[PDB]
Design a protein around this ligand. Sequence first.
Ligand SMILES: COc1cncc(-n2c(=O)[nH]/c(=N\c3cc4cn(C)nc4cc3Cl)n(Cc3cc(Cl)c(F)cc3Oc3ccc(F)cc3)c2=O)c1
Ligand SMILES: COc1cncc(-n2c(=O)[nH]/c(=N\c3cc4cn(C)nc4cc3Cl)n(Cc3cc(Cl)c(F)cc3Oc3ccc(F)cc3)c2=O)c1
Lengths: 305, 305
Amino acid sequence: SGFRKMAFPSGKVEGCMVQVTCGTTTLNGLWLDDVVYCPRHVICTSEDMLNPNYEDLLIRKSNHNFLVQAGNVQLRVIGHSMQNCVLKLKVDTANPKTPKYKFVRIQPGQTFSVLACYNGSPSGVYQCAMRPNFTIKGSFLNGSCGSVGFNIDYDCVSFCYMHHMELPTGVHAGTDLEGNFYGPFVDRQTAQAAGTDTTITVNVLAWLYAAVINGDRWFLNRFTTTLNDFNLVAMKYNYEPLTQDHVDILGPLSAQTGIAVLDMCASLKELLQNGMNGRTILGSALLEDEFTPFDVVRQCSGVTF
Amino acid sequence: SGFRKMAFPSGKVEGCMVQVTCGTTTLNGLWLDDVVYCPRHVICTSEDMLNPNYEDLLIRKSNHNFLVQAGNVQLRVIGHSMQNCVLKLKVDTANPKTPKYKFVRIQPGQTFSVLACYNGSPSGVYQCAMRPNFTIKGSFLNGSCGSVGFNIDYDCVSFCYMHHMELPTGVHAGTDLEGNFYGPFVDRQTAQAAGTDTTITVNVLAWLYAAVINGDRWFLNRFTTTLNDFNLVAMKYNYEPLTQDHVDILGPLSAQTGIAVLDMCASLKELLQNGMNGRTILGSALLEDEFTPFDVVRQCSGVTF
Ligand SMILES: COc1cncc(-n2c(=O)[nH]/c(=N\c3cc4cn(C)nc4cc3Cl)n(Cc3cc(Cl)c(F)cc3Oc3ccc(F)cc3)c2=O)c1
Ligand SMILES: COc1cncc(-n2c(=O)[nH]/c(=N\c3cc4cn(C)nc4cc3Cl)n(Cc3cc(Cl)c(F)cc3Oc3ccc(F)cc3)c2=O)c1
């Protein structure tokens, strides 16, 4: 019983964090096999950050300009190359703690675990969600650049996020491990703003199902709704539209609880129109939208109350 | 910037989880050096759980009755002994991944990281707090027994919690690594209830300071309060009394923000009497009480907005 923001164990990823330095610019890197991945921003000097031409700055660099430190052990760079916004540094030693891994790109609404890292040493782990506007509401301080996000699926680490920068609104932006940014952002020290954000409807419903499985039911009702009438209410409250396919993914949760998806939508509509009135759901006074259907199954018993 | 429930990286603890089996009872264990720690409840058969005499059941057991599995590697037990509610199994191999560690007991209101484990393999990590009634509001399923809580302080793992059981209210109870339970609970499969819970006042104020450091200030006011007048309001709302020493620990946060502790108390009193009115603090519509002053410093910049 219980429900909490849960991150994957970070052990398999801890053994891959390294420190990467170019001149006086320093940040975190990810050492897998004999390659080190890190943001290409590391090759910028302070005066290059405002408006860099990266492939003009990279030709001007040599291997011995890159200092890679795994703990106290210095790694020697034997080759470099640029892949979009990610710099790939070929080293002489294959990381002995390299786990099975893939490079995956996540969709808006999906979640992942984040290993906050400073100077190559991890400091914390927590769960995050990719917002519909392609930012994340993480917790990052100066020097966190290079930190990575990931999911774990039977020993295999799916890396999906590399942290790059903070935005004026206090949200964070980054790329996948291929160097392709999430959203309409770039690697330049100019002020960039995120688009307007929305609420992940399917995630809300999954969280409501989690509540039912954990014994809460006050928000349920006897009313029913159609998919479209719900969407007309959701749009007025800045909720993402619900697709008929979004309903199918909620099938397993609907069957284990015996509550039709559109019946759970009826409760969501009423919650949107009357608030919660000081009442709470799973210890929260807001509707939580950072738990996917998969997170709910991963945590909740297979048997309802 | 940002604020999130953050757990310590679990890598150093992952390398110590093992599976312990006695007869058909199975649960998680902690392998440090050549000793394996686990709940003594593992030596109970189904019919012994309702009312066991543990030192009567332990004399009836021999070393070869205990199967210890670290992954697929079986460990051979060369000695056993009971320390309060914790069973200590001496094995022949010293764990090569044994980190520097201490055994510490935490106080009500302190936080720790929890590594949820099933059959000796970790499945998740998250942050928890010890409630004033000595329970924790964790996320645990059947088989999580033996999971451990911990803090990490410069390479050294301070183990502080070993999970034992779930209560009828859905909260969780356990012991320190010495086998001494937290709160008035025992290891018997009988229904036990937790005392009434309270809100950790000092933690609330620390969370309010975290908000100020991250740019939020709408809840601040110009009013001032004395320590006692606040306590008279807090008692009516089931808040823990604030001691003059509790104020001193909030000193660093008060100085970095320039807000007198009793001024922050004035805001708390008004928040208690008028609610939040649909407004949020750090993305929460409730007053959060699971962040200590130390957690706030660990996460927030040393420079306020
Ligand atoms: C606490 O809040 C934070 C949370 N998370 C991350 C950060 N954070 C950093 O930690 N370091 C940043 N720059 C660096 C400065 C350095 C000085 N040294 C010696 N080494 C360095 C390495 C880096 Cl990377 N930056 C800005 C940034 C990083 C990158 Cl990759 C980039 F491509 C552009 C860019 O400029 C922008 C871009 C957009 C924007 F809206 C504002 C500034 C940044 O935001 C701060
Ligand atoms: C999902 O919710 C949960 C979240 N976290 C933990 C649990 N959870 C377990 O996972 N296993 C439990 N028993 C076991 C059964 C087993 C069958 N096999 C083959 N192996 C076994 C090993 C154990 Cl340990 N128990 C009860 C419990 C464990 C211990 Cl140590 C104890 F000392 C007494 C006791 O009985 C009580 C005590 C108080 C109470 F209010 C209710 C029952 C338990 O609560 C459930």
